[PDB]
């Protein structure tokens, strides 16, 4: 029967026995034990170890298989993936499905895990009451059978499917069969941009309920205009028999307070002509002065449900955490207790680098603290409902929660062929109606969506109203079809940027603050995914943050994404290393884009976090005269646990400190005024810099922890007073083939024939292994790239637009390389042509001054054909032959930053060891660079002007000729890579150009000037 | 101060090279002790009697960003003829030149001011590749304004009809010339990208006779 229906090639069957949907339960049998939340007696995991065996499709399955153990079956834990044990491969693709778009069929090879389990039920659990098993998670399909007979079937990967085993179960040794097939006609509603692994891969439970039961729960609250009143709606449903002795009682608790209560018998009130729900009953508790949820005071009151007999004996009892909290939209602003809302928010997939998509508590948490502390108050459970863990967490941490079903068809042709096709409603409208109805009581959630990139058609339409209809208390948001369907209350677009229009047929991305104000057009935006953190990546996030905060209707978004989906794979020395799309044997895959995340799949940061960290911050500062204006962005808390630290520094050097208490209100102003500080010792720039610090520990950060910043210029004294000249001369030396330079111990080298620096000697050690050449070019970010690949060029690439103009092969042309003495210096002139195939891209005209005190000045004058795309950079670069510990420079730091990504760092003396200097992004780019720079110190050298430098043991060109960061070799000495002008990073999205204009180099004409000396 | 800031000398050398002089100077600008600005210059002149003339110009970031950041002389020679290569023809500044076209031209010099009724700096071009005027050639990439009237004039003069020709020609050479705003006339209204905030700035002339 099993085989020969195929329920796995049917969308008409998404079930076969599998219990109705509800919120979590315990079944608790002990009232004080449901009000603290402690482990439940008739609650009971399933997790650890479970015997596996691996077949390529469900015919291969031997019948023996349902009443005894294999013996070619391994002992493995469960829950897991069972691509991350080995037995088959992972699929890395994007859009493309990873089979043959045939729906509703699958391949007739068809990965088949058969897990099973041998475990003991107490007989007191079949004795009364009903045994039901959990599956929190099965990827894609399955059946289960329970001491060999046949129980039932269940889809969608990302929901608990139950079953009721009270009939199969036996007293002591008992034996489930369950067999998972890879693909599924599910497996056409789940084409997220993510490794395609199956298994079982969330938690396994046995939960014992009375006959006479608590079936399901509602919990609403309703306030009144100013919220110091609330009505807590508790409606309640039972199964088993109707006795007019039983009673519901809900009872509130605030901590070890019960602060209201309320008993009934069941029987509702009547609904329509033929009566009400007997076997139902709602209770109404006032509540004044809540105290209110939100994510920056997550206030939690407990709800206990009993079940029990009018003379007092319990029969069970559930709960939940309760947070008192209203959304709704108004005037176009979405309104949290009556306060628009601002989303510093980040998409969020569930993923472990060694456990694949099996979620742990320990990571989960570790998430959560990472997302505080760098100024995150929403995730996107993009785009699945989570792990039921998650919920709790965000409930009690405090995180808004946009619960998302398990529906994407992006590889449809087009995308919305199986949401506009009523043959797909049904299997749909389980995917949003069994997510609603496991997670409404969560105060976490605030935003309902009905899935992703599935474009948009009727199925939408419909399950948008079931919600409205069934839900009222939380918007409903899609994507799909255009950002702006009939089918969401909030504007939702995916990398539509600040300025820009990108005027897509059918379905545009206008410019956000253009979208806001179409004619007719009133709700409000916050965009599900932007900033695409791929890579080298966040170039332009500070244009959001100053539209977000400009514009009341633009109320933030969602970065995509919070974490790399990197695997760990191991070398032959056994050495983990972090794996991507391909790498598995996985054909065709995505390559590099499943890493997409702010940190690494380790959850190292990568150095975008911290300029998401200071966009998102929670004060506004300005500087008027002596004074400090800040101001709090919080909407219902008071800084209560903020103290504000200020330094002025003349160029590093430490003048004056302090520390004031910040007392502002939510949306509040504090003065803060400066004393007189004392006039600066010597000439340069004076800059403040202020911060603020949270002295005292919380749920989420320690003591001493850093939430906001800002820096300002003060004052500047140029330096007029001339360094006193020194006594020694430099002298020249002219041969056929080199220009020599010597000051005692000192000597420089530029050769004639090349026209550039090709040695220095400081006595009679070499300082390059590589002359100091000109260079346009870096090797190509992530946002370079695109989705460009050797078998498919895509032309406006910016890469492909360097590599068609012979950027990287361009070869210097020797116009001009001249010497002459000065009274106190020796004055070396050069000009260079870049040239490709006739054509001339840039040319570079330099002076070197080389003076008494063994300084050299450079001068370099670039010009830019204007029908060259943009160049990437223009600077300097070389080998020095040295490798030093430490390096030591006056600019912005410590992390990396970049043209359009630099609001973070901050202008100081910063001093790290060399190995902070690389990035190690798991695909190998350009990385590293800080800008600002006026002083850089690296062994015996010193530059120092205005420009920009990275400095690594990796040359430009191994980064961009190996794919993977362990493939890396530290190289001989030192590259260093000394640049006047560097373009922007881009990161709007991943496969278009998105470098705005103001970041390219289209001056068409550039001076930098350097001093190279020793320190 | 930046009206009645007087150029103190810092530096003035004189090098012979193969085929050139080199004269290096610098200069501050200070009102009251503060420095506002330093110039930097090199003028090279080569055997074929054109001088180079390299400017950069530091600007301190505590004093407000300076009207324009060029070099300004009065010539003795009056001649009928304005000749550029450059934006045009009419006057336009940096946050007005998207009217104008880069093109050869050609007009007497009274084109070249524009008789505003309450006088005040007018006439400037922008983009301006060459310059010709009588026997002399300004070839780089620049902005420039030509007329009788000199700026002091200009600003002393609270009417067009008052206005009188001084002897020669007063000639004005930006590298850099600030945006004239217009969104109000009672509040500052030049945009952030049109200020003159860089902090360091670098342009390079060519003057020679043809
Ligand atoms: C590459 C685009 C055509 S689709 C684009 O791919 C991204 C890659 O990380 C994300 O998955 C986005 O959600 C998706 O819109
Ligand atoms: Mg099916
Ligand atoms: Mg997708
Ligand atoms: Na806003
Ligand atoms: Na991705
Ligand atoms: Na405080
Ligand atoms: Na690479
Ligand atoms: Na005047």
Same mark, same amino acid.
């Not at 599910?186 to 009375?210: A, N, T």
């Not at 029969?315 to 809302?341: M, Q, S, T, W, Y």
């Given at each position: 029967?099993?085989?020969?229906?195929?329920?796995?090639?049917?969308?008409?069957?998404?079930?076969?026995?599998?219990?109705?949907?509800?919120?979590?339960?315990?079944?608790?049998?002990?009232?004080?034990?449901?009000?603290?939340?402690?482990?439940?007696?008739?609650?009971?995991?399933?997790?650890?170890?479970?015997? $596996?065996?691996?077949?390529?499709?469900?015919?291969?399955?031997?019948?023996?298989?349902?009443?005894?153990?294999?013996?070619?079956?391994?002992?493995?834990?469960?829950?897991?993936?069972?691509?991350?044990?080995?037995?088959?491969?992972?699929?890395?693709?994007?859009?493309?499905?990873?089979?043959?778009?045939?729906?509703?069929?699958?391949?007739?090879?068809?990965?088949?895990?058969?897990?099973?389990?041998?475990?003991?039920?107490?007989?007191?659990?079949?004795?009364?009451?009903?045994?039901?098993?959990? $599956?929190? +998670?099965?990827?894609?399909?399955?059946?289960?059978?329970?001491?060999?007979?046949?129980?039932?079937?269940?889809?969608?990967?990302?929901?608990?499917?139950? =079953?009721?085993?009270?009939?199969?179960?036996?007293?002591?040794?008992?034996?489930? !069969?369950?067999?998972?097939?890879?693909?599924?006609?599910?497996?056409?509603?789940?084409?997220?941009?993510?490794?395609?692994?199956?298994?079982? =891969?969330?938690?396994?439970?046995?939960?014992?309920?009375?006959?006479?039961?608590?079936?399901?729960?509602?919990?609403?609250?309703?306030?009144?205009?100013?919220?110091?009143?609330?009505?807590?709606?508790?409606?309640?449903?039972?199964?088993?028999?109707?006795?007019?002795?039983?009673?519901?009682?809900?009872?509130?608790?605030?901590?070890?307070?019960?602060?209201?209560?309320? @008993?009934?018998?069941?029987?509702?009130?009547?609904?329509?002509?033929?009566?009400?729900?007997?076997?139902?009953?709602?209770?109404?508790?006032?509540?004044?002065?809540?105290?209110?949820?939100?994510?920056?005071?997550?206030?939690?009151?407990?709800?206990?449900?009993?079940?029990?007999?009018?003379?007092?004996?319990?029969?069970?009892?559930?709960?939940?955490?309760?947070?008192?909290?209203?959304?709704?939209?108004?005037?176009?602003?979405?309104?949290?207790?009556?306060?628009?809302?601002?989303?510093?928010?980040?998409?969020?997939?569930?993923?472990?680098?060694?456990?694949?998509?099996?979620?742990?508590?320990?990571?989960?948490?570790?998430?959560?603290?990472?997302?505080?502390?760098?100024? /995150?108050?929403?995730?996107?459970?993009?785009?699945?409902?989570?792990?039921?863990?998650?919920?709790?967490?965000?409930?009690?941490?405090?995180?808004?929660?946009?619960?998302?079903?398990?529906?994407?068809?992006?590889?449809?042709?087009?995308?919305?062929?199986?949401?506009?096709?009523?043959?797909?409603?049904?299997?749909?409208?389980?995917?949003?109606?069994?997510?609603?109805?496991?997670?409404?009581?969560?105060?976490?959630?605030?935003?309902?969506?009905?899935? #992703?990139?599935?474009? %948009?058609?009727?199925?939408?339409?419909?399950?948008?109203?079931?919600?409205?209809?069934? #839900?009222?208390?939380?918007?409903?948001?899609?994507?799909?079809?255009?950002?702006?369907?009939?089918?969401?209350?909030?504007?939702?677009?995916?990398?539509?940027?600040?300025?820009?229009?990108?005027?897509?047929?059918?379905?545009?991305?206008?410019?956000?603050?253009?979208?806001?104000?179409?004619?007719?057009?009133?709700?409000?935006?916050?965009?599900?995914?932007?900033?695409?953190?791929?890579?080298?990546?966040? +170039?332009? =996030?500070?244009?959001?943050?100053?539209?977000?905060?400009?514009?009341?209707?633009?109320?933030?978004? $969602?970065?995509?994404?919070?974490?790399?989906?990197?695997?760990?794979?191991?070398?032959?020395?056994?050495?983990?290393?972090?794996?991507?799309?391909?790498? /598995?044997?996985?054909?065709?895959?995505?390559?590099?884009?499943?890493?997409?995340?702010?940190?690494?799949?380790?959850?190292?940061?990568?150095?975008?976090?911290?300029?998401?960290? %200071?966009?998102?911050?929670?004060?506004? /500062?300005?500087?008027?005269?002596?004074?400090?204006?800040?101001?709090?962005?919080?909407?219902?808390?008071?800084?209560?646990?903020?103290?504000?630290?200020?330094?002025?520094?003349?160029?590093?050097?430490?003048?004056?400190?302090?520390?004031?208490?910040?007392?502002?209100?939510?949306?509040?102003?504090?003065?803060?005024?400066?004393?007189?500080?004392?006039?600066?010792?010597?000439?340069?720039?004076?800059?403040?810099?202020?911060?603020?610090?949270?002295?005292?520990?919380? !749920?989420?950060?320690?003591?001493?922890?850093?939430? !906001?910043?800002?820096?300002?210029?003060?004052?500047?004294?140029?330096?007029?007073?001339?360094?006193? !000249?020194?006594?020694?001369?430099? %002298?020249?030396?002219?041969?056929?083939?080199?220009?020599?330079?010597?000051?005692?111990?000192?000597?420089?080298?530029?050769?004639?024939?090349?026209?550039?620096?090709?040695?220095?000697?400081?006595?009679?050690?070499?300082?390059?292994?590589?002359?100091?050449?000109?260079?346009?070019?870096?090797?190509?970010?992530?946002?370079?790239?695109?989705?460009?690949?050797?078998?498919?060029?895509?032309?406006?690439?910016?890469?492909?637009?360097?590599?068609?103009?012979?950027?990287?092969?361009?070869?210097?042309?020797?116009?001009?390389?001249?010497?002459?003495?000065?009274? #106190?210096?020796?004055?070396?002139?050069?000009?260079?042509?870049?040239?490709?195939?006739?054509?001339?891209?840039?040319?570079?005209?330099?002076?070197?001054?080389?003076?008494?005190?063994?300084?050299?000045?450079?001068?370099?004058?670039?010009?830019?054909?204007?029908?060259?795309?943009?160049?990437?950079?223009?600077?300097?670069?070389?080998?020095?032959?040295?490798?030093?510990?430490?390096?030591?420079?006056?600019?912005?730091?410590?992390?990396?930053?970049?043209?359009?990504?630099?609001?973070?760092?901050?202008?100081?003396?910063?001093?790290?060891?060399?190995?902070?200097?690389?990035?190690?992004?798991?695909?190998?780019?350009?990385?590293?660079?800080?800008? +600002?720079?006026?002083?850089?110190?690296?062994?015996?050298?010193?530059?120092?002007?205005?420009?920009?430098?990275?400095?690594?043991?990796?040359?430009?060109?191994?980064?961009?000729? @190996?794919?993977?960061?362990?493939?890396?070799?530290?190289?001989?000495?030192?590259?260093?890579?000394?640049?006047?002008?560097?373009?922007?990073?881009?990161? #709007?999205?991943?496969?278009?150009?998105?470098?705005?204009?103001?970041?390219?180099?289209?001056?068409?004409?550039?001076?930098?000037?350097?001093?190279?000396?020793?320190?």
């Amino acid at each position: 029967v099993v085989l020969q229906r195929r329920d796995w090639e049917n969308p008409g069957v998404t079930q076969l026995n599998r219990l109705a949907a509800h919120p979590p339960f315990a079944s608790w049998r002990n009232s004080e034990e449901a009000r603290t939340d402690r482990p439940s007696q008739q609650l009971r995991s399933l997790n650890g170890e479970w015997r $596996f065996a691996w077949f390529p499709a469900p015919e291969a399955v031997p019948e023996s298989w349902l009443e005894c153990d294999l013996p070619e079956a391994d002992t493995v834990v469960v829950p897991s993936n069972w691509q991350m044990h080995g037995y088959d491969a992972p699929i890395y693709t994007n859009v493309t499905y990873p089979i043959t778009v045939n729906p509703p069929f699958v391949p007739t090879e068809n990965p088949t895990g058969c897990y099973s389990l041998t475990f003991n039920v107490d007989e007191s659990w079949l004795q009364e009451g009903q045994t039901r098993i959990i $599956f929190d +998670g099965v990827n894609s399909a399955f059946h289960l059978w329970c001491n060999g007979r046949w129980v039932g079937y269940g889809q969608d990967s990302r929901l608990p499917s139950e =079953f009721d085993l009270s009939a199969f179960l036996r007293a002591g040794e008992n034996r489930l !069969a369950v067999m998972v097939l890879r693909w599924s006609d599910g497996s056409y509603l789940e084409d997220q941009d993510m490794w395609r692994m199956s298994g079982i =891969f969330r938690d396994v439970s046995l939960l014992h309920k009375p006959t006479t039961q608590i079936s399901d729960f509602h919990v609403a609250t309703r306030f009144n205009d100013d919220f110091s009143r609330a009505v807590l709606e508790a409606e309640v449903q039972m199964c088993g028999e109707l006795r007019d002795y039983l009673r519901v009682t809900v009872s509130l608790w605030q901590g070890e307070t019960q602060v209201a209560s309320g @008993t009934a018998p069941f029987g509702g009130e009547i609904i329509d002509e033929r009566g009400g729900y007997a076997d139902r009953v709602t209770l109404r508790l006032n509540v004044e002065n809540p105290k209110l949820w939100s994510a920056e005071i997550p206030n939690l009151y407990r709800a206990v449900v009993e079940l029990h007999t009018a003379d007092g004996t319990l029969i069970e009892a559930e709960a939940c955490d309760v947070g008192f909290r209203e959304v709704r939209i108004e005037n176009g602003l979405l309104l949290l207790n009556g306060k628009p809302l601002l989303i510093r928010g980040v998409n969020r997939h569930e993923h472990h680098p060694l456990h694949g998509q099996v979620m742990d508590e320990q990571t989960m948490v570790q998430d959560i603290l990472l997302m505080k502390q760098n100024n /995150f108050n929403a995730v996107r459970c993009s785009h699945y409902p989570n792990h039921p863990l998650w919920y709790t967490l965000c409930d009690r941490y405090g995180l808004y929660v946009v619960d998302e079903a398990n529906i994407e068809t992006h590889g449809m042709v087009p995308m919305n062929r199986l949401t506009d096709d009523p043959r797909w409603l049904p299997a749909m409208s389980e995917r949003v109606t069994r997510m609603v109805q496991r997670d409404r009581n969560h105060p976490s959630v605030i935003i309902w969506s009905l899935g #992703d990139e599935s474009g %948009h058609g009727a199925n939408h339409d419909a399950l948008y109203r079931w919600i409205k209809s069934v #839900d009222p208390s939380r918007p409903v948001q899609y994507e799909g079809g255009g950002a702006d369907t009939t089918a969401t209350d909030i504007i939702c677009p995916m990398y539509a940027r600040v300025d820009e229009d990108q005027p897509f047929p059918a379905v545009p991305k206008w410019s956000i603050k253009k979208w806001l104000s179409l004619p007719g057009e009133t709700r409000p935006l916050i965009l599900c995914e932007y900033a695409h953190a791929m890579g080298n990546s966040l +170039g332009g =996030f500070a244009k959001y943050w100053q539209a977000f905060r400009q514009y009341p209707r633009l109320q933030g978004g $969602f970065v995509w994404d919070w974490v790399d989906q990197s695997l760990i794979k191991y070398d032959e020395n056994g050495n983990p290393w972090s794996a991507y799309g391909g790498d /598995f044997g996985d054909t065709p895959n995505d390559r590099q884009f499943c890493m997409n995340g702010l940190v690494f799949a380790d959850r190292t940061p990568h150095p975008a976090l911290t300029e998401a960290k %200071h966009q998102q911050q929670f004060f506004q /500062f300005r500087l008027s005269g002596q004074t400090i204006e800040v101001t709090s962005e919080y909407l219902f808390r008071h800084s209560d646990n903020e103290l504000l630290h200020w330094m002025v520094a003349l160029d590093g050097k430490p003048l004056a400190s302090g520390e004031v208490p910040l007392d502002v209100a939510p949306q509040g102003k504090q003065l803060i005024e400066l004393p007189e500080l004392p006039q600066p010792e010597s000439a340069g720039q004076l800059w403040l810099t202020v911060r603020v610090v949270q002295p005292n520990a919380t !749920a989420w950060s320690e003591a001493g922890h850093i939430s !906001a910043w800002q820096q300002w210029r003060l004052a500047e004294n140029l330096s007029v007073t001339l360094p006193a !000249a020194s006594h020694a001369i430099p %002298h020249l030396t002219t041969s056929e083939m080199d220009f020599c330079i010597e000051l005692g111990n000192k000597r420089w080298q530029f050769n004639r024939q090349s026209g550039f620096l090709s040695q220095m000697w400081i006595g009679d050690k070499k300082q390059l292994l590589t002359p100091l050449r000109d260079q346009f070019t870096r090797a190509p970010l992530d946002n370079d790239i695109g989705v460009s690949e050797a078998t498919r060029i895509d032309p406006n690439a910016w890469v492909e637009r360097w590599k068609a103009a012979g950027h990287y092969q361009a070869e210097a042309a020797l116009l001009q390389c001249t010497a002459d003495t000065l009274a #106190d210096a020796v004055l070396i002139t050069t000009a260079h042509a870049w040239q490709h195939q006739g054509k001339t891209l840039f040319i570079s005209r330099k002076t070197y001054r080389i003076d008494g005190s063994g300084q050299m000045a450079i001068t370099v004058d670039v010009e830019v054909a204007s029908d060259t795309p943009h160049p990437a950079r223009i600077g300097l670069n070389c080998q020095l032959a040295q490798v030093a510990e430490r390096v030591n420079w006056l600019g912005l730091g410590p992390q990396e930053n970049y043209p359009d990504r630099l609001t973070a760092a901050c202008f100081d003396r910063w001093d790290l060891p060399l190995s902070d200097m690389y990035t190690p992004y798991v695909f190998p780019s350009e990385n590293g660079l800080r800008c +600002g720079t006026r002083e850089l110190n690296y062994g015996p050298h010193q530059w120092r002007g205005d420009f920009q430098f990275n400095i690594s043991r990796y040359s430009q060109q191994q980064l961009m000729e @190996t794919s993977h960061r362990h493939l890396l070799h530290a190289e001989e000495g030192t590259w260093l890579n000394i640049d006047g002008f560097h373009m922007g990073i881009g990161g #709007d999205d991943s496969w278009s150009p998105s470098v705005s204009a103001e970041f390219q180099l289209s001056a068409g004409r550039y001076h930098y000037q350097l001093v190279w000396c020793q320190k």
